Amino acid sequence: NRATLQ
Amino acid sequence: NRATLQ
Amino acid sequence: SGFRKMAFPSGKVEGCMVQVTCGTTTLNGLWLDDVVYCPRHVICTSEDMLNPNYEDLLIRKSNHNFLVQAGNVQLRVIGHSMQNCVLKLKVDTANPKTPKYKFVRIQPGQTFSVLACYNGSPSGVYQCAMRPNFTIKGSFLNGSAGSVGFNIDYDCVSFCYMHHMELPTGVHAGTDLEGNFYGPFVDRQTAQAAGTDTTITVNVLAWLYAAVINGDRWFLNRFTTTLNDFNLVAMKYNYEPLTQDHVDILGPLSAQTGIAVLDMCASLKELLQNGMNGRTILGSALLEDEFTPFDVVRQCSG
Amino acid sequence: SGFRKMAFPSGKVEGCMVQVTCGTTTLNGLWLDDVVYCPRHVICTSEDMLNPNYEDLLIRKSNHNFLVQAGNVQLRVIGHSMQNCVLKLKVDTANPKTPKYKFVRIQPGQTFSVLACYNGSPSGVYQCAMRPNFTIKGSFLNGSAGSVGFNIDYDCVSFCYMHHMELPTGVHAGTDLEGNFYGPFVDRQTAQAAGTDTTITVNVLAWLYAAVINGDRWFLNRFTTTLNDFNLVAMKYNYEPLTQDHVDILGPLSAQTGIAVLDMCASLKELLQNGMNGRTILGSALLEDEFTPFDVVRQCSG
Numbered sequence: 001n002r003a004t005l006q
Numbered sequence: 007n008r009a010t011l012q
Numbered sequence: 013s014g015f016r017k018m019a020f021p022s023g024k025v026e027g028c029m030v031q032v033t034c035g036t037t038t039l040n041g042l043w044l045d046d047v048v049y050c051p052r053h054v055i056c057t058s059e060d061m062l063n064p065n066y067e068d069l070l071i072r073k074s075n076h077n078f079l080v081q082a083g084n085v086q087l088r089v090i091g092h093s094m095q096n097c098v099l100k101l102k103v104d105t106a107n108p109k110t111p112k113y114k115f116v117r118i119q120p121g122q123t124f125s126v127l128a129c130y131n132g133s134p135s136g137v138y139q140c141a142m143r144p145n146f147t148i149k150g151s152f153l154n155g156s157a158g159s160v161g162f163n164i165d166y167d168c169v170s171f172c173y174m175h176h177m178e179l180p181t182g183v184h185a186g187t188d189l190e191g192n193f194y195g196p197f198v199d200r201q202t203a204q205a206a207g208t209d210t211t212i213t214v215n216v217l218a219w220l221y222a223a224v225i226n227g228d229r230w231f232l233n234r235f236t237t238t239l240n241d242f243n244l245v246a247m248k249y250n251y252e253p254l255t256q257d258h259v260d261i262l263g264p265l266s267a268q269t270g271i272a273v274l275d276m277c278a279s280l281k282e283l284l285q286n287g288m289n290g291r292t293i294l295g296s297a298l299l300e301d302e303f304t305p306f307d308v309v310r311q312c313s314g
Numbered sequence: 315s316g317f318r319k320m321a322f323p324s325g326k327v328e329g330c331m332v333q334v335t336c337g338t339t340t341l342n343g344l345w346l347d348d349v350v351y352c353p354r355h356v357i358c359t360s361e362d363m364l365n366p367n368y369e370d371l372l373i374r375k376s377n378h379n380f381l382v383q384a385g386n387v388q389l390r391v392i393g394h395s396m397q398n399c400v401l402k403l404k405v406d407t408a409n410p411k412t413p414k415y416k417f418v419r420i421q422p423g424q425t426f427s428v429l430a431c432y433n434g435s436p437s438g439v440y441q442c443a444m445r446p447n448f449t450i451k452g453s454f455l456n457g458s459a460g461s462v463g464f465n466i467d468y469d470c471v472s473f474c475y476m477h478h479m480e481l482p483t484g485v486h487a488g489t490d491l492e493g494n495f496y497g498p499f500v501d502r503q504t505a506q507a508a509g510t511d512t513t514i515t516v517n518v519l520a521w522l523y524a525a526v527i528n529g530d531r532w533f534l535n536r537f538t539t540t541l542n543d544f545n546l547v548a549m550k551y552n553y554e555p556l557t558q559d560h561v562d563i564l565g566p567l568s569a570q571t572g573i574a575v576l577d578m579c580a581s582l583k584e585l586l587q588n589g590m591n592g593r594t595i596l597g598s599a600l601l602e603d604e605f606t607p608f609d610v611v612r613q614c615s616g
Contacts, residue, residue, distance in 0.1 A: 001482045002503045005355045005363055006341075006459045007180045008201045011053045011061055012039075012157045013484045014453040018438035021429065023325030127323065136320035136613070137439050149597070151316040153615045182315045182529060227484060295451070297599035311438070313455045 015222050015294050017302070018311055019125035019137040020164040027109030030087065031132030032101070032158065033079040040129040040158030041080065041101070042174070042189070044110050048080055048087070048101040049189060051157045051176045052094060053199050061201045070094055081132060082107075096191030097199050098174060111169050115189040118172040120144045121212045121252075123304055124161040126173070128152065140173075141215070141302035144252065145206040146195025147183035148173070160189070179204055211301045213251045214258040217276055218305040221265035223293045225312045230291060232271065235278040242277040249284045261305045268314060317524050317596050319604070320613055321427035321439040322466040329411030332389065333434030334403070334460065335381040342431040342460030343382065343403070344476070344491070346412050350382055350389070350403040351491060353459045353478045354396060355501050363503045372396055383434060384409075398493030399501050400476060413471050417491040420474040422446045423514045423554075425606055426463040428475070430454065442475075443517070443604035446554065447508040448497025449485035450475070462491070481506055513603045515553045516560040519578055520607040523567035525595045527614045532593060534573065537580040544579040551586045563607045570616060 032041040032050045035057065041050035053061070055069050055077075073092070078101055080087040091102030118124065123141045127134050128151065140148045140161060152159070152175055161173030175186045176199050183206060185197040197204055220231070243253050259273045266273045280299075288297060334343040334352045337359065343352035355363070357371050357379075375394070380403055382389040393404030420426065425443045429436050430453065442450045442463060454461070454477055463475030477488045478501050485508060487499040499506055522533070545555050561575045568575045582601075590599060 001505070003482060003487075003499070003506050004456070004480045005353075005358065005478065005501060005503055006454055006456050006480055007203070009180060009185075009197070009204050010154070010178045011051075011056065011176065011199060011201055012152055012154050012178055013455070013480060014451060014486065016440040016451075016453040017319055018430070018440045018453060019321060021324045021328050021436040021439055023323075023328040023436075026323050026325040128320070134323040134325075137323055138318040138320045149316060149318075151318040151320060151613055153315070178315060184316065292600070295600075298594070298597075311453055 013226050015226055015311060017139045018307075019139045020162065022125065022127045022134065022137045024111040024164065024169050025127050025160065025162055026134045028107060028111070029127070029129050029132055029134060030080055030082045033081070034073070034077055038131060039155060040132055042158065042160055042171070043082060043087070043103075043107045044113060046103055046106045048103055049174065050099050050101065051174065051187075051199065052097050052099050052191075053157070053176070054099070063200055063202070066094065083132070097176065097187050097193060098189070098191035112167050114168055114170045116170045116172050117188040117190075117192070118142055120146060121215060121304070123302060123307055124163050124172050126150055126161045126175075127159060128156055129159045130155045139302070141212070142194065143183070144210045144212065145208065146197075147179065147185055147206045147209075150175070150184045152178060152184050161186075179206060181206070211249075211251045211299070213246055213254050213301075214261065214305065215301040215303050216251075216299050217258075217262055217273070217280060218265060218308045219294070219300045219303045220276055220279065221262070221269055221271070222303065222308040222312055224269045224271060226294065228293050231279045231283055231293065233279055233282060236272065236275045237278045237281060239274065239277075242274070242281060245281045245284060251284075265305060265308060315528050317528055317613060319441045320609075321441045322464065324427065324429045324436065324439045326413040326466065326471050327429050327462065327464055328436045330409060330413070331429070331431050331434055331436060332382055332384045335383070336375070336379055340433060341457060342434055344460065344462055344473070345384060345389070345405075345409045346415060348405055348408045350405055351476065352401050352403065353476065353489075353501065354399050354401050354493075355459070355478070356401070365502055365504070368396065385434070399478065399489050399495060400491070400493035414469050416470055416472045418472045418474050419490040419492075419494070420444055422448060423517060423606070425604060425609055426465050426474050428452055428463045428477075429461060430458055431461045432457045441604070443514070444496065445485070446512045446514065447510065448499075449481065449487055449508045449511075452477070452486045454480060454486050463488075481508060483508070513551075513553045513601070515548055515556050515603075516563065516607065517603040517605050518553075518601050519560075519564055519575070519582060520567060520610045521596070521602045521605045522578055522581065523564070523571055523573070524605065524610040524614055526571045526573060528596065530595050533581045533585055533595065535581055535584060538574065538577045539580045539583060541576065544576070544583060547583045547586060553586075567607060567610060
């Protein structure tokens with residue numbers, strides 16, 4: 001999956 | 007050994 | 013995501029910490045309104061620590077024997093008294109940083125944050141559990157007495173622990189904020205031993221749920237068990253009995269993950285009997301029991 | 315005695331945390347003097363997160379698009395600019411709680427405390443290491459961006475980390491306080507992977523010394539090794555090479571315990587090749603590498 005900007 | 011009041 | 017031993021922010025408590033000196037003995041105190049709370053053995057001498065008579069030692073003291081320093085400002089003691097194993101030093105300045113606070117006594121199995129202090133100055137924050145044998149596995153050196161354990165809910169600091177001493181095994185004992193020791197310990201440098209400890213089962217399950225929420229699933233199985241058959245295995249590996257109330261407390265976590273509590277118990281039974289076989293759970297090769305169900309919900313979001 | 319993952323007191327940083335809202339996106343900012351620092355993706359929309367052009371997105375914004383709230387007091391943005399991957403929002407009120415601070419970039423192997431925040435409100439404190447692959451194993455959910463990592467020496471807060479994002483493996487990436495990412499990551503919701511990690515050897519040895527100081531001695535032996543033969547075993551178990559400078563840093567601990575660094579290396583070699591055989595060190599069944607030599611000295615007293 002992709003990174004998550006938090 | 008004994009307890010140590012800290 | 014991620015799961016860490018996580019302490020409450022300590023600012024509200026930092027502003028309450030002061031240094032209390034009597035003679036050659038120094039420790040920390042808790043400054044709330046116009047009162048400083050500290051362990052009573054501050055009035056002890058090095059020699060008067062095998063079996064002190066605190067009631068005698070205190071009648072031989074006066075307000076000017078107690079040196080209280082908030083930072084570098086000296087606070088003037090205008091009164092003193094003993095409440096069980098702690099002292100209440102009336103001072104003429106109310107602490108302006110006094111937070112909304114409560115004095116609560118906690119139960120074995122519950123956790124709290126510890127603000128370790130020395131000479132009235134905070135040094136570090138960490139998370140502790142009250143063990144079934146009423147000790148805590150902390151990190152404390154000489155001069156740390158007076159440090160407090162606490163939880164924070166909304167804006168209120170619930171003080172639950174003041175540090176007093178270290179037992180020969182390296183574990184630590186202390187009082188609630190009314191001065192009553194947790195467990196069968198006394199503030200004397202005698203040979204004392206805590207009763208045999210047990211592992212907090214409900215916390216282990218809660219930690220396993222935190223693991224599922226964070227993607228660790230290798231320990232799950234298709235099996236289930238009864239509360240009775242599970243508790244038989246618990247007794248064997250020195251685990252506390254699991255009650256129907258523990259199953260209810262674990263409801264929310266059981267609901268979020270879709271794993272029934274008694275199905276999770278089948279996983280724990282399996283980890284107890286066979287081990288981890290070289291794998292890890294949330295970065296641990298041991299079953300962790302210092303996270304309450306509440307701690308997990310606090311950290312892990314839906 | 316006792317040894318715990320221990321964070322710095324967080325009060326000085328708590329007073330710096332604010333909430334930054336742009337449109338429907340909210341995160342935390344760091345309020346020092348008359349400037350608020352926050353991750354730049356606050357200006358992003360849910361759709362503009364695969365490959366944002368931050369320079370375009372920012373030219374389409376103005377001071378009134380940024381809503382900054384210190385508690386419930388709204389701070390008025392009077393200026394805005396981009397510095398690498400963070401924003402500098404000039405406000406008309408200097409933070410009265412601004413501590414003495416530094417902006418430092420740390421090295422893999424060093425640790426720091428993290429004040430996890432949401433909507434500008436601190437939620438918890440924990441201790442982190444910067445991994446050799448420039449990720450950190452933290453505990454962060456949506457809305458935690460803007461939280462900062464820091465150390466405290468004397469009265470000075472040395473800010474070293476601002477949180478931005480979570481990688482698919484669950485580890486976390488962020489920037490220094492000048493906005494430059496740690497590691498080869500970018501603030502885009504793309505498929506990114508950290509390089510293979512390694513274990514911080516000097517920290518493991520330091521932790522073994524902490525164990526000796528606290529009475530754990532079962533892993534000691536009478537043997538010794540050379541730095542060369544040790545490093546051969548390190549390479550095999552995915553451990554970082556040990557340098558002469560690591561041996562010097564470990565000097566003080568080697569002196570306090572009377573255990574020569576290369577004798578301690580013989581113990582580590584042995585634990586790597588044979589395991590722990592069911593025993594524990596400081597309550598862990600794994601070799602812990604998130605304690606620096608400095609962290610040990612900070613906690614363990616002479």
